Amino acid sequence: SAKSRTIGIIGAPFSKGQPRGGVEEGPTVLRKAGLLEKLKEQECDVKDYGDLPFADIPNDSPFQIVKNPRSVGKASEQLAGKVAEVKKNGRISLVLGGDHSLAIGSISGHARVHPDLGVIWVDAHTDINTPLTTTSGNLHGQPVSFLLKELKGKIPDVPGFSWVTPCISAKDIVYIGLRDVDPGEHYILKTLGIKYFSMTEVDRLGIGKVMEETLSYLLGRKKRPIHLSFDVDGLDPSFTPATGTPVVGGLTYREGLYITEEIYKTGLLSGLDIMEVNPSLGKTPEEVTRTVNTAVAITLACFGLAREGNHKPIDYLNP
Amino acid sequence: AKSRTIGIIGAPFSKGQPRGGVEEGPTVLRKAGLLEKLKEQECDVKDYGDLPFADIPNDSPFQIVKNPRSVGKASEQLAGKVAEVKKNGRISLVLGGDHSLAIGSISGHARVHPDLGVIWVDAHTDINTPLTTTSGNLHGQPVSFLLKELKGKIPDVPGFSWVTPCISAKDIVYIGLRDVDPGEHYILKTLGIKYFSMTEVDRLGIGKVMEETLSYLLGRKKRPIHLSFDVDGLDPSFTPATGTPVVGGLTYREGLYITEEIYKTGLLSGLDIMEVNPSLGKTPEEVTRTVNTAVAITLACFGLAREGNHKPIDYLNP
Amino acid sequence: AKSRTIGIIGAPFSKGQPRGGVEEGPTVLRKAGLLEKLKEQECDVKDYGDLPFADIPNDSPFQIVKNPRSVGKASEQLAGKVAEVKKNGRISLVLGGDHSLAIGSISGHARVHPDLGVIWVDAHTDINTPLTTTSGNLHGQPVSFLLKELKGKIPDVPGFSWVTPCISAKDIVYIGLRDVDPGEHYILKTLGIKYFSMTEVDRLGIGKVMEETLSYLLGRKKRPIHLSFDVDGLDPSFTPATGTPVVGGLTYREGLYITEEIYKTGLLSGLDIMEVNPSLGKTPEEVTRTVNTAVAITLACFGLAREGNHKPIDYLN
Ligand SMILES: O=C(O)[C@H]1NCC[C@H]1CCC[B-](O)(O)O
Ligand SMILES: O=C(O)[C@H]1NCC[C@H]1CCC[B-](O)(O)O
Ligand SMILES: O=C(O)[C@H]1NCC[C@H]1CCC[B-](O)(O)O
Ligand SMILES: [Mn+2]
Ligand SMILES: [Mn+2]
Ligand SMILES: [Mn+2]
Ligand SMILES: [Mn+2]
Ligand SMILES: [Mn+2]
Ligand SMILES: [Mn+2]
């Protein structure tokens, strides 16, 4: 089996990273749609590591305004050890979320085995708010701030985040689909000189040129591991409505598939995160199934599923 | 103008697929006022009526291939009618009906113009052979019967003895592919057919897709163009009333852009409007939405431009 | 900043077209908190109020052209107000109202800045003359009254004697055309006006469309820009509450791109947000969808960028 199709499923039923309950059922509904079975139909080497058991911390006191610091920090700490275990076996770590605060552990654990990795962040938001710049206190919009090497000293010592060691630099992360960025978040994005492709850049260049520039920026000099942190709210709410923070004028169903198809084509996808799938925030049961079917289609395109077609290495006309 | 001289051919046929209602396609396309709207944009329109597809009851399946004699005779009858329309110097407009009728529509057009180029706008390749197919529906098998390179791979199917492969692998271009079977993808890649799947449409844009399509078919020499348009090629948000709808399709704008560029070459000689099923809609609005989009696609093929259209007269001095 | 100094003008007028409710356009735009959202965006906002349009009795139609004296007076009153806003060093923001008011908005803006360039975002050319029109609705006739090359082709219509042709055929660019009348297409091609119909938008992409639009109008040297935005220029799936909706229009993203690019030049001098009709929304959701889109379009004209916006201070320390 090919390295680009060898996967290691990791279930992350966590929700204390944001104030809306239901996102912890994300890995459950994705499995119910037959994600592991549809991947095996695509000639993929699939090995399940099950759902991580996240213990309850009732004595979790808020740091300044930051909500559930010990619960979020422990969840990512438990995920980091599991993601590193999947990478040691030589398998692509597939984290099923859950909120985007789990990206702290998923990227840290992946960096323990492959420290030369590049991050492609598909989201409507930067998720770069520091515990001092945050206005909501939700840690699902704070993962990148804890992971950046350039922000070493600007991040205060929040309880449960002691294990966190900055692994990625400002030049090793690329944003795709930005359309709802906070004033504090936009300042950090421009001061550190991080490469980004907001909806303005996607409309200007087209999804073809956006993917051509993204891959040439991270792989142009040398072939390095790729970590794709995919937030479903990165796509328009017409395709992914069952999510925590929906923002209009997002990436289309075709644009999302094109991003994921080009990432598979490089044969360097090493880490993958499917985050913010909330089956309870859906207005109708059709809106819930639509978000899950889109999230499944995004995942299958990461491991081989191409729109032009897929065939086994055999003669179909003369078998 | 020859690019606006049309010959309407009604093809009420549904035995190419298992879902009933697609035979009512020419009836509901006419009811939307297609012939009236074409005469409005200065087109010379001649209606040849609906083809009388006689009932073939004794039609046993070939292995798993459903209704072989009915599909074969319907295409053989359409081939004779399309050739008759082309002999009178008119653009053959085949109102479908299921896409299996393309066998006869392209074969009949090839009898008068053998040097023609095919533009296949569809979500599917329809290149399954009677042996590689899994459903046995002939509506997903037309391209296999027409390709010269697949000679020796098509078995003796009852009702298809008249079929002679007329188009080469280099004489066909696909646009809008997003649901291709493993057997179909093997044929598409081995024969080296030029294709623009939804991945290529997202990569280059509909502008470069059409620029490359016309340069690939009219590069060597200017030759007649046959446009086989399956309404499922467009997204189900514009054409929901169809048998096989697939998400992430061509937009209403992309569909108009393809058809507007094909008219501007002045080489469109054959056109198929297939898979319009007025009984496979969730609401009556979804049925009217598919037909209005199908009529808009057809009007753009014969002159209707979004920038505007005007007669060669002084509008400021009537 | 000069690019964020605005002068709000309310234009509750509907006699340019037959569908009632477009006069409630500035009312629902204000209810959505447009002025408040602009002030939060570090904009210097001055509200000149909603213009009172007195009902003219016995306004007989000129041939087939409906309500000529009402449309003419509404544009005459708007011309004086737009010029007053331009003299105070502010960007004129006209809240419509039907698109016939563009006669007054562009004329009044041209009285202070005669070297202005017009960017017309619309599904229609609105270039019909009082003789080529088949409906007689003046909302589809504003460009004909404004063009210098069409002087002598426009008859003496009552209420329009004050109109002086202020823009030339080379000074206007259309974006998003898909429903152009035969008479209108004849004028568009014979005058050699630059246009980017839905066909050109699909061909080049909104990125190349904006690059060519701004290079064609500003190429020689920096000059004022008048953006006349008709909400029907965008697809009816984003702006359904409108008088003349045409399928296959500009997306919500494309509309934000056009407006984000015009702000970046720092030369936006005049702005029209027209044809918002809250009575033409099938569901109250369709009404809010159109107004939310119209507000987003207006905010992008005065700084709101999708990549993010921040004050000139240190957010870390
Ligand atoms: O920091 C926060 O809590 C908020 N500031 C930007 C929008 C919102 C975060 C969006 C949710 B997520 O981080 O998952 O993209
Ligand atoms: O071979 C088949 O029966 C099937 N394979 C793909 C979808 C289906 C064929 C659909 C025919 B048409 O594209 O015209 O809708
Ligand atoms: O002249 C007319 O009455 C009509 N010809 C095209 C459509 C219609 C004008 C629409 C005016 B507007 O673009 O502002 O909605
Ligand atoms: Mn996120
Ligand atoms: Mn997000
Ligand atoms: Mn087909
Ligand atoms: Mn099809
Ligand atoms: Mn208008
Ligand atoms: Mn309009």
GROMACS .gro file of C-alpha atoms in nm, chain B residues 205-208 238 251-254 256-257 260-261 264 305-311 313-318, chain C residues 129 132 150 153 177-180 182-183 185-188 195 197-199 201-203 247-251 254:
model
   54
  524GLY     CA    1  -1.146   2.848  -1.494
  525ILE     CA    2  -1.424   2.820  -1.757
  526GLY     CA    3  -1.237   3.086  -1.969
  527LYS     CA    4  -0.918   2.878  -2.026
  557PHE     CA    5  -2.986   2.466  -1.147
  570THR     CA    6  -2.271   2.675  -1.261
  571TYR     CA    7  -2.558   2.838  -1.463
  572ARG     CA    8  -2.293   3.100  -1.578
  573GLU     CA    9  -2.032   2.832  -1.678
  575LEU     CA   10  -2.396   2.970  -2.063
  576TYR     CA   11  -2.025   3.056  -2.121
  579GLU     CA   12  -2.189   3.120  -2.595
  580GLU     CA   13  -1.827   3.035  -2.705
  583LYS     CA   14  -1.925   3.237  -3.174
  624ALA     CA   15  -2.556   3.663  -2.571
  625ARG     CA   16  -2.563   3.802  -2.211
  626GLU     CA   17  -2.393   4.131  -2.330
  627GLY     CA   18  -2.703   4.187  -2.553
  628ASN     CA   19  -2.835   4.123  -2.908
  629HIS     CA   20  -2.951   4.372  -3.176
  630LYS     CA   21  -3.080   4.369  -3.541
  632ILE     CA   22  -3.082   4.861  -3.797
  633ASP     CA   23  -3.044   5.215  -3.651
  634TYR     CA   24  -3.222   5.189  -3.310
  635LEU     CA   25  -3.187   5.569  -3.252
  636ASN     CA   26  -3.361   5.636  -3.594
  637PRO     CA   27  -3.648   5.376  -3.655
  766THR     CA   28  -3.336   5.669  -2.427
  769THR     CA   29  -3.585   5.349  -2.744
  787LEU     CA   30  -2.598   6.107  -2.669
  790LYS     CA   31  -3.059   6.206  -2.926
  814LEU     CA   32  -2.433   4.269  -1.763
  815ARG     CA   33  -2.677   3.981  -1.855
  816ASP     CA   34  -3.013   4.149  -1.951
  817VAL     CA   35  -2.948   4.418  -2.219
  819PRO     CA   36  -3.170   4.549  -2.838
  820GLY     CA   37  -3.177   4.933  -2.843
  822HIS     CA   38  -2.694   4.691  -2.695
  823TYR     CA   39  -2.693   4.910  -3.014
  824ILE     CA   40  -2.595   5.222  -2.804
  825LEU     CA   41  -2.336   5.016  -2.599
  832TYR     CA   42  -1.803   4.664  -2.043
  834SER     CA   43  -2.073   4.143  -1.898
  835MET     CA   44  -2.124   3.807  -1.711
  836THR     CA   45  -1.961   3.648  -2.024
  838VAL     CA   46  -1.653   3.786  -1.582
  839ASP     CA   47  -1.664   3.405  -1.659
  840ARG     CA   48  -1.386   3.447  -1.927
  884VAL     CA   49  -3.036   3.465  -1.276
  885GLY     CA   50  -2.659   3.390  -1.320
  886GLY     CA   51  -2.535   3.707  -1.153
  887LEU     CA   52  -2.225   3.817  -0.959
  888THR     CA   53  -2.163   3.620  -0.639
  891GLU     CA   54  -1.734   3.889  -0.639
   0.00000   0.00000   0.00000
